Design a protein around this ligand. Structure first.
Ligand code: DRD
Ligand code: DRD
Lengths: 253, 261, 253, 261
């Protein structure tokens, strides 16, 4: 029944609302300018960044490295909200505990980049819960290894954003990502694929009802799942350059 | 010998009385209107269910009814365990065999005795204080609606055999003492008791239902219907891990369901 | 009429024979040594106990706790034989069903300790239907809470056994115990006391005819009924220490 | 609200399961004999210690045992850090506060969870593969023998409270979120979380131990025993600089012990 698939969609969208306080709808309002009153502080160079550093870690290092560190910090926060949203996907908590941990270990990065896109435009990204805005041009200008980190996330966002997904579409897409039966080291693949097949069904009906005029959006959306694997693999390999060739250490356990 | 067998039948009936407060006679007296004390509140839909719970003045719906089934089934296990201990020869058996026989017997016996509380229109709940309609139960959201109907289909046909409590006392003793439960260490001492219970069940039906042709065989055939209801239910349980969020049953039922057929 | 009271005694003694296969007469034969041929295996330490464990639950725990558990098991068996003997006491099955259950709930412990005495001497107790013999010294040696459990049963047995009751005396004494009109929660006290008054009469004549030389044995026997209440109360309070302060669980419902 | 608090309790229990492989239930199952896999080799003296190390076929003694304590305590820090991160609100705190709370919380939590592995006769070591006796540990050359006994005296009494893993999951979360650690920049956001954890701990004990009088207060009183064990241990550490030759602890523990109370 469609009605069951709609109620699952609805239930996913409500859990997503709780887990993630800065939604696409809210961020697009800030990127554009709905109800303009609390316009975020813009960080467009080294000067404005420090202006905005002691406007709100604290100064004691090279700026590229503190920005990079700040992203480590923020992405450990985001793993906690993602972990919470996962618990609400039907069937997920009744899976083997170790496979639960394995799905999250490998899912979380792909989910963080999908969600960052809601915070990005072609020119910069919302930071500190929509309070700052950092320009892509400034991120691009940082010294060489650090200059190339965010740029591939911006390229993906721009292409993903022209799909015009909303939060209720993304609530299901996020769940399909978590429940991927091909991650290394999963004990029971079959129960995970049975869950994902039900979420695939609900995703498909969601897009058909919400975007009747985008032909084959379901399929273009699945195909974005290869682009995401590649951003993750690129980003993981860029962490290797850091680990080897750098002097600063302060990382989240 | 006859006298042995009649005294076996009387013993089990007396202990069945002591172990199960809501017997068939009492459920039928309530269902029939015959009672002279109090008439059961009927739950036929979502508004009357709200009123039925909130008759508490003197989660969601499906989950909260599936949760009320658990508490009741926990209590029935205890009542059934108490009756087992009184079956001659049962407590003298290997302790692991006593455990295995209950682990497997108990749900067969739950469905058997749940027929006593059913007609084709619904089921008596809360010590016979409510009545939930078959149509309401069947209306429930996908999986949870699937749990209830096969129990009704069984009861309607078991119920046309017209067994009474004293017949039932021995039938249930026969179920418990089944020598084909997996993992039994000492099959023969169990089979020997089942044999003597079978002989008693036989005499009891001949004496109690002299006009009822092949009642004994028709009753043992029901034993196969029971086993299929239990295998169906256990398949339903797996559906509940996949479709639902945090499920994890009550401690005593997790044990009963752990590594079961 | 005495003749009615004698026929009741006789009828009680015959039911008792059926219900309880290891009688005082048989156990005293084994404690002493009539027809010596099948001399029970003696359990006098941890070594001989295990020698006798895999000579016949099975090994997987602390020995004090398995002995204690074994006694739970055996005493649930004995409740079934006692329940059966009760049905044969005239008037008992025609009492209120709930009062029948209440008399047995509270009577059964006092009866188990009266009957154990037939299996005891000053030095140990017959176990496994007269096949084993466990020494009092070994029970006494078990770790501290478990060491003190059986010792008060041995003290009572030694004092009760010097009364020299036989099975036909005990068949009536057991029946007088079951039919006690003072247990908590009895609905109809009066019909129970009318039955017990008839059993008291038969007991009195039994002892007068069987033990004419023991002055006032009837009265010394009634007085043993307070000693028995106290063993039961002591034993019930010793179960409280267990429930609170222990780690192992495996108990009969 | 109750539902909030029960779901807080379940969350912490689930993440406690994921972060600590040797839980109380498993250590007690091993200590109890209840396990069905493998029985621990006991070290009671110097000959059996040699055999216990050299059970490696499938420095001096005191120093080599004090060195094995370090490796284990390093791993427990990592496990405890992993559990901290999962405590709602913890990763959103000032980064220096997160560091300070761990710096101080971790040894309190080490002694707490070390009680799970103790009885009055000894301690389970190497993932429950060995057992070192209390008498052996106490026999050790002056200072090194002094390290062990106060831990046993604590465990015996903590252990008579009969907490289980799910109780423990919240107790340990309460310890971490202590707003009185020296050098904290932002006390109130921590205290607010401890408050909500306290409310949850309270409900959990009432529900899990309904017959256990003032369990909650008796458990918070243990928090003072813990702090005195940590101050005692740190005094023991200074003794080890004076009495011993080259000592210098492992990198991560030097950090934890650097400028501590
Ligand atoms: C022995 C259960 C009898 C029963 C009932 O009939 C059950 C028919 C099918 N059935 C038998 C067992 C069983 C069942 O058993 C479980 C607990 C899952 C099991 O043993 O594994 C689960 C679902 C259905 C089911 C329906 C509703 C009840 C509802 C209630 C309630 O207390 C209640 C709860 C909420 C609102 C109103 C009333 C009690 C018992 C019910
Ligand atoms: C978490 C430690 C548990 C533990 C153990 O119990 C420790 C009880 C008291 N205690 C807690 C922490 C601690 C302790 O911690 C240090 C590392 C100094 C610290 O954190 O600062 C130092 C001494 C004693 C001590 C005894 C022996 C062990 C021995 C071993 C071994 O691997 C081992 C080493 C050598 C020979 C046989 C076995 C591991 C753990 C042991």
């Amino acid at each position: 029944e469609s009605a069951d698939l709609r109620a699952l969609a609805k239930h996913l969208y409500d859990s997503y609302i709780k887990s993630f306080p800065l939604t696409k709808a809210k961020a697009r309002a800030i990127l554009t300018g709905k109800t303009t009153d609390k316009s975020p502080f813009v960080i467009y160079d080294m000067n404005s960044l420090m202006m905005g550093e002691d406007k709100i870690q604290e100064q004691s290092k090279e700026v590229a490295i503190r920005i990079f560190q700040g992203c480590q910090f923020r992405s450990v926060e985001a793993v906690q909200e993602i972990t919470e949203y996962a618990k609400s996907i039907p069937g997920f908590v009744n899976l083997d505990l170790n496979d639960q941990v394995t799905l999250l270990k490998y899912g979380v990065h792909e989910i963080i980049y999908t969600m960052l896109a809601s915070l990005m435009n072609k020119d910069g990204v919302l930071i500190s819960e929509g309070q700052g805005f950092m320009t892509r041009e400034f991120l691009k200008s940082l010294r060489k290894p650090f200059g190339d980190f965010m740029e591939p996330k911006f390229e993906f966002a721009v292409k993903f954003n022209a799909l015009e997904l909303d939060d209720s579409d993304l609530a299901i897409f996020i769940a399909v990502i978590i429940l991927s039966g091909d991650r290394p080291g999963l004990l029971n693949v079959k129960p995970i694929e049975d869950i994902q097949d039900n979420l695939l069904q609900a995703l498909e009906l969601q897009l058909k009802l919400n975007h009747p005029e985008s032909s084959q959006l379901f399929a273009k959306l699945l195909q974005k799942m290869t682009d995401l694997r590649q951003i993750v693999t690129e980003h993981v390999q860029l962490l290797q350059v850091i680990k080897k060739t750098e002097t600063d250490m302060s990382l989240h356990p």
